Amino acid sequence: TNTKGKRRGTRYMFSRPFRKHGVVPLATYMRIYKKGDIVDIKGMGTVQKGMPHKCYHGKTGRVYNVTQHAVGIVVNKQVKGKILAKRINVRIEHIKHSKSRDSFLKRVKENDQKKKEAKEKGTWVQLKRQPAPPREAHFVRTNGKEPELLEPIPYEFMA
Amino acid sequence: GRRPARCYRYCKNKPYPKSRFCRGVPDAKIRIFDLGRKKAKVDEFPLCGHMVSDEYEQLSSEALEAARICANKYMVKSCGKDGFHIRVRLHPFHVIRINKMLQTGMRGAFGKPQGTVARVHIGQVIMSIRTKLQNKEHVVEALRRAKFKFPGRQKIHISKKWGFTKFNADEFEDMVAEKRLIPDGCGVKYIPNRGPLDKWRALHS
């Protein structure tokens, strides 16, 4: 059987990228995390303290607890047929914000722009993201010149 | 001594090189990967002929060694000591394993190193011979002699390149004329429009 062990198979996962070793850029340490802030987890190797487990690497949770150096974050690890929303204490540097939610919170406010505008004017706007439709009928112009004929190229071995 | 090449033909395992981990490896039979007049200038051996693999298989060091000899003999019998240059463009780096049954069984059956084998892809050069343009039919026959020393199917291609360079033979003299190429032994160094201009002044001095 495999060697059970906390940092097993994390040779590349918890490693730093190429020429992004050394000092942690300080913007990492000075971005505010609130309760209910959706947050993606990515174990930085430079800070060995308060690392998440390898199973939470490349997972996205929301923050329930905020301490001095770390945030308690609720994440869905799945064991077998059961998905368990569970609470891990991760230090700041193994965490970014998630831009996943932030394209919705603009669309919420954008819908609020297009709703209050023409609540009275009576132009019924579209607020649902309709899927990419079949492209509507159009005229392709061939401006004088003919379309170029293509023919398959004959075989000739290279090596 | 050693098993038939039927047993170790097909690229069965992952590539298993002679390393810190795989040690106690016996010495490969092929050591001289190039011979003939390998002290020859580009200008004098234009016509290159490649033996090319047509099958994804493992070619033994002992087969490479045999085909190296079989081509060298016929090339010396045709073109003389210094009328050609052979390169064996495969290096036997994959290690072959043997489960010596002398009463153990299939218990603890991980093989000791038996030999080495060259892992060859479809359209990979096994050997290549550069010579004078007259000796075209001799190269084709030399490589066809050496086909019988390998399993599977090999094709014998005549390159549209100048010798063992990566530049086309209908292009070569036009690039040595403008000094985009300068001869440097068996090879030719490409000289771009990119260096410091003092490099360029040494070109046209």
Partner: protein
């Protein structure tokens, strides 16, 4: 008398019969695991809501 050591063969089929249940994500989650010094204060903040009842 060697036997089969490990497999995960029929398991993914077994898991999906009664669904793979996402957790019963109820509103107002518990304040378990929230830092004590903060949870102390929040409890005091609730304790004295009577004070500013007339003002509210």
């Amino acid at each position: 008398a060697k036997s089969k050591n490990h497999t995960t063969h029929n398991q993914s089929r077994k898991w999906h019969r009664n669904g793979i249940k996402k957790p019963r994500s109820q509103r107002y989650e518990s304040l378990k695991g929230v830092d004590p010094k903060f949870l102390r204060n929040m409890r005091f903040a609730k304790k004295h809501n009577k004070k500013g009842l007339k003002k509210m």
